[PDB]
Each structure stands twice: as structure tokens, then as C-alpha cells.
Amino acid sequence: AQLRQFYVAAQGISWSYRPEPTNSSLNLSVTSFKKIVYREYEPYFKKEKPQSTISGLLGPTLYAEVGDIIKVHFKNKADKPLSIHPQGIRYSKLSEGASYLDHTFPAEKMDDAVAPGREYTYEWSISEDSGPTHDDPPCLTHIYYSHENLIEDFNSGLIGPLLICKKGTLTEGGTQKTFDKQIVLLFAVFDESKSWSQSSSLMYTVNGYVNGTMPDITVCAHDHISWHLLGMSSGPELFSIHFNGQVLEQNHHKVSAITLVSATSTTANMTVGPEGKWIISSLTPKHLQAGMQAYIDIKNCPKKTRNLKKITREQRRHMKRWEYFIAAEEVIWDYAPVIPANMDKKYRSQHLDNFSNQIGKHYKKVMYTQYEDESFTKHTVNPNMKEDGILGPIIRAQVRDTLKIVFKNMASRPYSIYPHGVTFSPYEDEVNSSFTSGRNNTMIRAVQPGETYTYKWNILEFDEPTENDAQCLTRPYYSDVDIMRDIASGLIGLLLICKSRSLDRRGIQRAADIEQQAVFAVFDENKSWYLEDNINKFCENPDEVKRDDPKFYESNIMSTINGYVPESITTLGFCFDDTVQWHFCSVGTQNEILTIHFTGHSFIYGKRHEDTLTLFPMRGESVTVTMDNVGTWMLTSMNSSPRSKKLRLKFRDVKCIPDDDEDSYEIFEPPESTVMATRKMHDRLEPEDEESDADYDYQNRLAAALGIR
Amino acid sequence: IVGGQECKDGECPWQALLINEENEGFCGGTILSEFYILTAAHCLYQAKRFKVRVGDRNTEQEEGGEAVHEVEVVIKHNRFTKETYDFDIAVLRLKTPITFRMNVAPACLPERDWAESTLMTQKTGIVSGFGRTHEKGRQSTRLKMLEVPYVDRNSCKLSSSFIITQNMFCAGYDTKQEDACQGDAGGPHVTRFKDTYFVTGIVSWGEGCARKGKYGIYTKVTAFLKWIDRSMKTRGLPKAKSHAPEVITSSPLK
Amino acid sequence: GASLISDRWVLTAAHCLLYPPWDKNFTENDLLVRIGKHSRTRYERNIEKISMLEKIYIHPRYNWRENLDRDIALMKLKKPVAFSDYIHPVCLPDRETAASLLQAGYKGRVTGWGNL
Secondary structure (H helix, E strand, C coil), X not given: CCECCCEEEEEEECCCCCCCCCCCCCCCCCXXXXXXXXXXXXXXXXXXXXXXXXXXXXXXXXXECCCCEECCEEEECCCCCECCEXXXXXXXXXXXXXXXXXXXXXXXXHHXXXXXXXXXXXXXXXXHHXXXXXXXXXXXXXXXXXXXXXXXXXXXXXXXXXEEECCCCECCCCCEXXXXXXXXXXXXXXXCCCCCCCCCCCCCCCCCCCCCCCCCEECCECCEEEEEXXXXXXXXXXXXXEECCCCCCECCECCCEECCECCCCEEEEEECCCCEEEEECCCCCCCCCCCCCEEEEECECCCXXXXXXXXXXXXXXXXXXXXXXXXXXXXXXXXXXXXXXXXXXXXXXXXXXXXXXXXXXXXXXXXXXXXXXXXXXXXXXXXXXXXXCCCCCCCECCCXXXXXXXXXXXXXXXXXXXXXXXXXXXXXXXXXXXXXXXXXXXXXXXXXXXXXXXXXXXXXXXXXXXXXXXXXXXXXXXXXXXXXXXXXXXXXXXXXXXXXXXXXCCCCCCCCCCXXXXXXXXXXXXXXXXXXXXXXXXXXXXXXXXXXXXXXXXXXXXXXXXXXXXXXXXXCCCCCCCCCXXXXXXXXXXXXXXXXXXXXXXXXXXXXXXXXXXXXXXXXXXXXXXXXXXXXXXXXXXXXXXXXXXXXXXXXXXXXXXXXXXXXXXXXXXXXXCCCCCCCCCCCCCCCCCCCCCCCCCCCXXXXXXXXX | CCCCCECCCCCCCCCCEEXXXXXXXXXXXXXXXXXXXXXCCCCXXXXXXXXXXXXXXXXXXXXXXXXXXXXXXXXXXXXXXXXXXXXXXXXXXXXXXXXXXXXXXXXXXXXXXXXXXXXXXXXXXXXXXXXXXXXXXXXXXXCECCECCCCCHHHCCCCCCCCCCCCCEXXXXXXXXXXXXXXXXXXXXXECCCCCCEEEEECCCCCCCCCCCCCCCECCCCCCHHHHHHCCCCCCCCCCCCCCCCCCCCCCXX | CXXXXXXXXCEEECCCCCCHHHCCCCCCCCCCCECCCCCCCCCCCCCCCECCEEXXXXXXXXXXXXXXXXXXXXXXXXXXXXXXXXXXXXCCCCCCXXXXXXXXXXXXXXXXXXXX
């Protein structure tokens, strides 16, 4: 029943696409266009609000609670009668802000006839059914706009955020009680070419900021912050945003990425950690010709101290001398597998060797592997683990996992390593950070070919996810020196940020099994850094150059899986009692969502049983799937032609009768057979079999939780 | 709601009470034929002696000449975990044969084929037992047999801290009321399939029995066919007609 | 019940020896003590030996008339007994080992039959 009255007035402001407070670059300004944006005013519309620096072209951020009234007052000052169309429920057609053929009374258009210079108060409210009061965040944002012309009521700056939070733990302004900050985000594409002033200026301006000139979000530590995931684009455009280092908690779930469309009503909150300079990686492959970068400036203001314990609470440590050895070698790896099965003649007899006199056999494709000792020449085996190929192998993290990535480059370009959303030490980098301070807190990831560097950091209990989600979260890692070119060169893998199921030094995955992933990255040779090892240097036909032709272009545009461009060597034929965790990923040069249809097969996610799923780039999607089926079918997609006609899968799933291990070949055992000695599922130990952990000979301290109490 | 109703004095034979020579019981058994009684292995191992009496609906009282089924010796099991619980099935080697009476009704032998058709259809079940798995403060003098539903396998490994294999699964209500350690240990969780009766569960204690309203632990004898077959044909024909039929066998149940 | 810290000074409770309202005060003869026993009807000699007390001591802050504030007695044993399987001594902790062990709570072994 609270009165949340606001005074918004739209006007045309010649706002530059770059924050230039100094009049030195105004004579040669590369941006000088008008923008009709929303601007808040005082009662009776006297003086203009100063507005935050983050809200360049964004209007006033409206805030409200449940069961309250919102007598918002608007005064248009542009040129055409605009309106305000929120996302409430109590507002009627007389005050809805939508001008269309309603087939009702003509007097219902009084909310849209707001002439430029006429005041009009909208009598709106909200019902009680707009409050979650559960596992959702205490706020439910909304987007209000003008229903006149969406092509103009957005590119000019006619966008504003509306907040309908929960009455109780919220203050006056949109900030919670236990949280001391309110971070509002906005990522838009102001297409100036399609608006009111038809001027050729197709530029990707995030809130009117180009080349990463967006004002940096800054907040000191020892406090709590709250986010607001908002930002509508011109239409079907998305934004692959990510919060490096600092992990948020969207929908009370510890996540670090969010990529939807049309500004989805979602807010989040988290708790800051140590001081530093983190990154807001706005890595949008389809939106990079203009510029969109941001970072995090975490200082240190000593105000309150939490009970955050560093190590686990007197039961879990597992201090082991296990450092992951990674050497950026240039072993001979090609798009086609070693001796292909389905005969990939398009790459075997054209680019794999000296056939057709194109590239050759000796390549420089660098792959991130994992050795077993300090040799930097052979891993667990001489080749690879087959099940991953050029993709990264199996890496698991736990408390004191000693993630000491002994990286020693030896190719022709300085590389590094960076796991997705991991907090490190002020001494070692392992993250594309610009934090260059003193020698004590310096961090440089530049590892020249020949020099070795170890990124030492102790992953502990403050680096684990929640409890309701899956065990090990999928976080694909990639090089931090380069952004888009190293991914095409085969420098990408996957990391398992698991929960608190640390049993021994390796962490026994309780109620789990093996892992089956699925990657589909479409890249090009021109995107990779080793473009010189194709047609110019590593070449044997200087008279005929395979360029400027569609034949050589599509020969590089390929979708790979486990380092195998045609088809993989393994099948998805599981059996019963397979509590595995399926992972999916599909990075590349795209930005929207990617889907895949499953015929005759389904999965389990969200306490239900869906058929198909939809993954997201940047981050990694994980789901615990139990593969129980008898027969064989296809897993094709429904798109155009280069991604729907050859993206099938041939496998046979059979379980006769339990896990099918009495007359076939599979790495499982029901057992259900003659057991006269020792077989599978025979956990008979002399001291004690199992229970929860192995802190002592019997574990005498009784406090096994799943995080900070 | 169907609560803890007692067993009927008609169609409730599967209750071979395993007691001692004195006035002190321990667990129970399962009636199927005249040469083998399915029960838990901890009934005898790490316990006391063994005294069986079939058709005994009451321990303190007696319904006449009906409870008689003495046992000579007994052995153990190969897959029986002494610390935890896994394939906890033991056979009681009786000494005197007993015919088929009213309170002693036989049952057909199970098979591996009734493993994919009995767990997906009959999502319930009954737990026959005098009440010796949770012998704390609910020792009822009457033979009680409540009804418990079946839950998905993905909710049985977390019911207890011990990781449960395929042999044992859920067989109780949700986390609401007391639905575990029901009846005597080795109690038959027979599920009326279709025109026949096949036992498919043995109640045993894991870490004891306390505040276990989550789920229950009950075995699956459909996979136990290779053990009941190796201990019935390799022993040979009954020499002295159920002596031992036949207790003279190795400890890992042959 | 009682306890034992070594082989001379024996400590026990104070609510079972001194009770003015009950009008029964023992001297240094009617206070026996038995160490090592697993039953009550049985009686051997090769595994245990009956002890005997002769010294008694009261407690300074014996304000049991409020809410029983520190009611622990302490006697003295003069029989030079030994230590075997049925007789096991026990030391005592100090302060240089539990300066911050507040988040614990290790229980003991309080044996006994149906006497309380």
C-alpha cells in the first residue's frame, strides 16, 4: 500500500557514445547524434535528476514492492505522443500505454495522447500474486516501454527498468537489508540506422558506450552486493555475459553466467571476497565490431567480518602433491582422427598429409593435456586418452586440490590457462586480468615458449557450488591471453567444480559414475592463430593459392567432437544403474542459443523427464542423466542443411537383462552371476567399509556440513 | 490411511521366528519350502544361538501345537558385509521336516525374470515381522505387518550414509513417519505379484535403527538365484531327510 | 559411583557420604571401595582385590543447600595395589592441549549396572 510515485519526462539529448567530459575531442568527435531517452524529474517536473554514470541512455530505474500503488506521473517532451507500457496486472486499457486497434471505446487511448509538453499521471498498482517469497530472489524486475514503434522506442533510448520486489527485507530504492549495494545492469544495441533519424550508424553501443568505454563498476570488499540482470536488445540478439572470479547466486544458485534474450526478469546477489581487479567478460562473438568490455574494481573498506573459514571444518583436507602438468606442445593433430573410421576423405586426402599438395602433415595445433610427472613429453600414455582427443581430459577439483598448473609453453606464441570462474592468488595470474600493482600482488600470465610458470592456488571449501544442483559443475577452461582466436586453435577443455564429496585424495564421487560429454565447436583456420601454417608457409603449391574460393572456405568450417570432425570413435550405449553426469557444450562464433533434438531418447533434469535440451556458450551445461533404453535410433537436429543433415549419431543401447554384462562387452557389472569368491559390489573391509569420510581411524569430531554454517 | 495393521491368522505363514534357547528372540525368517529359510546373516553372526519355530504368531503366548521347526547349525554368506549391509541373506538349516499346514504355507521359487516386471508394477508391499529390527520401545506382542510403498532408486543411496548397491533399494514411505526397521530382521517383504507370492526383501539394520523416516532397506532375491541354486543342488539329495539340508557346506555359501 | 586417578588419592561424589538431614555420618572404617568388577553375585580373587579407606577430606565450598555447587569428595588408599588387565589407571589433561577446542565434546565411558 506504499505510494511509489515517480516523475519521468522523456527528452532529446545529444548524448555522445563515449563519456568525454573534456572538451578536447569534441572538434574531432567520432560520435555526435541525438537520443530521445527517459529522464526522471522532481515533482511538478522542475529540475532533471543527475542520473548515475552507468545509465548513459537508460531511463530511471523504477522500484516497487508487492501490494503497493504506483501513481507514476509522465510528461512527454519529445515530438510524438509516447506512452508507458509496463508489465503489471492491475492497470486497465484506459491506462495501459498501448496504442493499437483495441476494438473498444476510443476514450481508452487517453494514456497514449501525451503530447510533447503535456502532463499525464498513470494510476497503476500491483497485486499480491507478484511476490515469490520462496527460493526466488526477493525482487522481480520488469521492463516498461512505449508501444508506439519498437524500432524507435528503443534505439533512441526509450528504455527503463521497473522493479517489483518483496515487502519486508527491502529498503527505499531497491536495496535489500543484508545487502548494502544495488547493481543495475543494461546491455542493449542502439541501432541508429533504424530509428527516427535515419543515419547510417550500425554500431553496437552497450548503453551508449563503444570500445569498452562503459563506466566501470566499483565497490570495496567486506560488504554485500546485489545484482539486477537486465538488458533488452533490438530483438533476437543476446549477450554472453560472465562474472570472472566473483561468483553470483542467481535464483539462490551459485552461478557465474547468464545469457537470455529480451531482458528476462531476473535479479541476483552475492558476497564479495578479497580485493582485486576482476573482469566482466562481455564476450559476444556476433557483437564485437564496435566494442563492449567491462571489469570489476574491488577495493577494501573494513566494515564487517563474516565467519568464513578458509579450510574445511576439521575433517576434510587431502593435502596431496598432485600438480597438473600442462605443456603447450605442437604434436601432429588434424581435423580427421588418427585413421578415420567413416573415411573422412574431405580432410584425409586433402589436408591431412601431402595429398592434393595443399598444407601438409606437420601441423602446429596446440592442445591442453595433462601429464603424470615432470617430463613435458608424455602423459599417462604416449598419444592421447582417445575419449577427449584435442579436448582437455578429465580434471577434478576438491579441497586443497593444489591446482598448480605447471604451464610451460613450447610452440610459437605465448599461451596460458584460465578456468571458468575461479578465484586465484595475488601472486599467480591464470586469468585475463589487468591488475598490475606491486611486486607482492602482481599477476602475469604471459608464458613465453620455453619458459615455465606454475599457477599455485589452493582450491578450498569456498570454491564449491550449492547443494541442490549436480555434484560437479561444468566450467570449460580456455586461454586467457587471447579471447576468440585461441578457442579455434584447440585450446579449450572442461573443469569439474564439484561439491563437498571429498572422500580421499581424489574425491570418491558418491552416487555417481563416469562422464560423457558432447562438444560441437564450429571454427575456421583463419580464426586460429596458426593461419600461416596452411597456405603460405606450410605450402607446396605457390602457383595455385587455395584462397578466394568457396571450396577452401568450407573445408575449414567444420564441427568437431572429441577432436574428431567427422564422427567419434565412442558410442552412447550405456546400461542400467548408470548414474553418470552428461555434459554439453557448443562454443564458436555464434551468440544465440543452440538446441538438439533426440528421437527415441530422453534425459532427466529439473525433477522431470524432458526430451530435448538447450545449452549455452561461454559457461558449461551439466545434467545427471540415467541412460535406460533398448534399441537404436537417430539423434538428428532440425535446422537448415549444414547442421541438420550430417549431425546424426549411430549407436545401439541394449540391456539384457540388467546392465548387459553376461555375454557382451561393457565397463559395468550388475553383477547378477555366479559369485563364489570376489566380484563387483563386494565392499567387505576388515576395519570399516564406508560412511561419510575418513578423517581418522573412526572420525571422532561430528560436524560434516556442506559449506559455511 | 492404512496404518500398522497386524498380520492375519490365515494368509501370513512367512514368519519363522529365530529365537534362542532362553526367553529371548533376535530376528525372524521366511517360509518358502522345507529345506531353506531366507533371513539376514547378522541374525546368527555376531549374535547368539539359533532357535526357529514356524507358524508362531506370538512369542509370549502359544497357539497350541504349531511352533516347531528347530535348527541344528548354520553358516554365513560370501557377499555378506560384516560392517555394513549387502546381500544380507542367510539360509537356516532346519533339523526336522514340517508339512504344509494352515499357518505353514509354501511359496513358489523366484527367478531372474521377475526383476523387470515386479518393481515397475507392484509399487507397494508388506513387511511381515514380529518387530525385532527396532527392538527399542515398540516391541508389540502381536505379529504386525504394515504396508509400505516403493520409491525410485535415485532416492535410496542418500537415505543412509552407507552407499547402497542394486541388491537393496527403497521400500517405504517418504520422509514423513516411521517406515523403517519394521518387523523382525530377515523379515519377508513378499509382494503379491500375480496369482503367486514371491518374496523380494529382507529388512536389516544399517547403523542401527534411529529416526529413519526417510526410506527402508530391503534386498532383492531375484538376483539371489545363483546362490539358492548352488546351495540346493551341490549339497546332493537329503541324506537323513533335512539334517542339515545341508549345513555341511563352506562358509562363503559354496 | 566413584573414580580413580592413580593408586592413592581416590575421589568420588559428596551427595552419597554426607547428609545431615539423614542423620548418618561415616568415620574411617565403614567406607569400602571395590575396583574391577563385572557382576555382583560372582566373587573371585585372582583378578581383583578388596581395597580399604582410612582418610577422608571435606570440600571447602560445600554449599549443597543451594543447587549442589561442586559436590566431589576425596579419600586416600593405603593398600599398595598393582595394575593389570582389570585394573587400568588414567592420567589427566592440562591446558596446553585444549586452548581452543571449544567446538568439540568428547564423551567418556560411564559404565555401571542398575544401581541408580
